[PDB]
């Protein structure tokens, strides 16, 4: 529709998944709020527009079309008002900083050690599959009450949910271009139900200290539980992003550090720098890159565009975190970048509920890795490819070390 952006008509979904930076660098300059035809939605690409939409009283939560097809209702990311307040009150207790501090070390450190012990003497590893993803999913899985679900299975589920959630391509008429791409998400949800329904059955009668047990029972009248259909979409929210993103973040941090070998050495020598390294990693490749959306509740003007009420806007936080209005050479990883705010955890009422937990999982995991393999080196015989528009991270991370 917008004449000077007619080039956007030729942007493909594959291009956004493999490398969205070049298109989004153009958007941040030409149209910070732009309608992207293949996504069928306005997209916010700069830090100012993302922050404004995410915090505006004239926007509220919505799920993208493919996200809604994947999760249904009421997913915590896509609801408002009394339902959202209830779901936030449901998930927040185990995520409270003072609560996390009581058990996070005893949770993650033995998990990290267990996975490291399988390969720390090999001289070679593929860290995404052998370390980052397993530690991420085993940590949260145990917190949730899914101790009996293998990390292989948790990893398969978040991968299938990822592909379904981000199956966003639409054709001329706004219809999904890849309707068969939701089937593996449906297959994952069916498997999840088969595993989790018996656990919910027993937690209803025998509550325990698992997070999902508390989701059923906390704040409810005596002898009542939240209905499982009411909580399952938020379970899916966790089994996608909460399972995937800490692993994405630590892997992207490592890739960034490998790109700056002097900085990798610094961090290995001084592990108190790991939190700073992770924060730059999340800015540099944001795990939740463009998954979330908001919808306008009244006519509103954003970046010079007059949006009617009812207009969805996708929040491309991963682009916002390369805003050259804020950062110098954002495409480069730099441990010594001056600490500034970033949007990798979103903003506003629907900002990430698990920041403190997530940052601790990534920090402990990197601590234990650099302890066990101080001479870690990137396998330069291999290249690192990143994949994902909605959720983005490296697809593998081959490393080596002298044994
Ligand atoms: C490095 C890892 C993570 C990153 C980068 C991340 C990022 C985000 C982002 C960007 C949002 C969306 C905010 C928006 O649309 O404005 C979000 C939402 C959320 N995240 Fe995190 N997340 C991470 C890990 C986790 C973990 C481990 C948990 C749970 C233990 C978690 C729980 C949640 C919840 C419940 C929401 C929805 C909040 C709401 O809609 O009210 N996140 N996260
Ligand atoms: C925390 O997990 C999510 C965040 C945004 C979209 C999908 C998710 O699973």
Whose CA is closest to 280, among 386, 369, 370, 362? 362
Domains in the chain, number: 1
Q: How far apart are CA 287 and CA 313, in angstroms?
A: 19
Contact at 8 Å (CB) between 139 and 114? no
CA 281 – ligand 2 centroid, Å: 19
Q: Check if 366 has its Cβ closer than 6 Å to any atom of ligand 2.
A: no
DSSP string, 24-66: HHHHHHH-SEEEEGGGTEEEE-SHHHHHHHHH-TTEEEE--HH
- Residue-wise burial string across 121-149, b where 16 or more C-beta atoms lie within 10 A, e elsewhere: eeeebbbbebbbbbbbbbbbbbbbbbeeb
CA-CA distances (angstroms) from residue 269 to 262, 334, 370, 371? 11, 17, 9, 10
- 148: Cα separation from own chain's centroid: 24
Contact at 8 Å (CB) between 62 and 292? no
In which domain, by residue range, is 351 found?
A: 1-403
Q: Check if 62 has its Cβ closer than 6 Å to any atom of ligand 2.
A: no
Q: What is the DSSP letter of 403?
A: -
**Hey, what's the torsion of the CAs at 129, 130, 136, 141, to 10 degrees?**
100
Experimental method: X-ray
CA 362 – ligand 2 centroid, Å: 17
CA–CA–CA angle 195, 84, 189 (5° rounding)? 20
Which ligand lies nearest the alpha carbon of 252?
1
Q: How far apart are CA 339 and CA 324, in angstroms?
A: 15
Nearest CA to ligand 1 atom 26: 242
- 163: Cα separation from own chain's centroid: 13
Q: How far apart are CA 121 and CA 29, in angstroms?
A: 48
In angstroms, this model's resolution equals 1.8
Is 6 labelled as part of a ligand binding site?
no
Is 236 labelled as part of a ligand binding site?
no
CA–CA–CA angle 369, 370, 374 (5° rounding)? 130
Ligand 1: atom nearest CA of 317 is 10
**Hey, what's the torsion of the CAs at 196, 202, 206, 212, to 10 degrees?**
10
CA 209 – ligand 1 centroid, Å: 22
Q: Check if 399 has its Cβ closer than 6 Å to any atom of ligand 2.
A: no
């Amino acid at each position: 529709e917008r004449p000077d952006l007619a080039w956007l008509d030729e942007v493909t979904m594959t291009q956004l998944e493999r490398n969205p930076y070049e298109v989004y660098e153009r958007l941040r300059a030409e149209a910070p709020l732009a309608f992207v035809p293949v996504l069928g939605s306005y997209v916010a690409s700069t830090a100012e527009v993302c922050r404004e939409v995410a915090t505006s009283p004239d926007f509220e939560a919505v799920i993208t079309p493919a996200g809604g097809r994947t999760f249904g209702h009421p997913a915590i990311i896509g609801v408002n008002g009394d339902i959202h307040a209830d779901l936030r009150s449901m998930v927040e207790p185990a995520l409270q900083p003072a609560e996390v501090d009581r058990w996070i070390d005893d949770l993650v450190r033995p998990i990290a050690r267990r996975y490291l012990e399988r390969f720390e003497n090999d001289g070679h590893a593929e860290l995404v599959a052998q370390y980052c993803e397993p530690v991420s999913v085993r940590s949260l899985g145990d917190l949730l009450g899914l101790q009996e679900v293998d990390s292989d299975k948790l990893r398969e589920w978040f991968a299938k949910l990822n592909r379904s959630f981000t199956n966003a391509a639409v054709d001329e008429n706004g219809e999904f271009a890849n309707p068969e791409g939701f089937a593996e998400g449906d297959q994952a949800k069916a498997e999840i139900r088969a595993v989790v329904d018996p656990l919910i059955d027993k937690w209803i009668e025998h509550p325990d200290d698992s997070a999902i047990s508390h989701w059923l029972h906390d704040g409810m009248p005596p002898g009542q539980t939240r209905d499982r259909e009411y909580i399952y979409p938020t379970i899916y929210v966790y089994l996608l992003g909460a399972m995937q993103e800490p692993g994405h973040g630590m892997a992207s941090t490592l890739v960034g550090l490998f790109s700056r070998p002097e900085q990798l050495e610094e961090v290995v020598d001084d592990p108190t720098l790991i939190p700073r390294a992770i924060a730059e990693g999340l800015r540099w490749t944001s795990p939740i890159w463009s998954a979330g959306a908001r919808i306008s509740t009244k006519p509103v003007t954003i970046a010079g565009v007059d949006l009617p009420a009812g207009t969805p806007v996708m929040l491309s936080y991963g682009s916002a975190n390369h805003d050259t209005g804020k950062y110098e050479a954002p495409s480069q990883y730099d441990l010594h970048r001056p600490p500034l705010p970033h949007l990798a955890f979103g903003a506003g009422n629907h900002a990430c509920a698990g920041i403190y937990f997530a940052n601790h999982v990534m920090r402990i995991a990197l601590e234990e890795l650099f302890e066990a393999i101080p001479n870690l080196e990137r396998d330069t015989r291999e290249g690192v490819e990143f994949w994902g528009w909605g959720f983005r991270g490296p697809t593998s991370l081959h490393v080596t070390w002298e044994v």
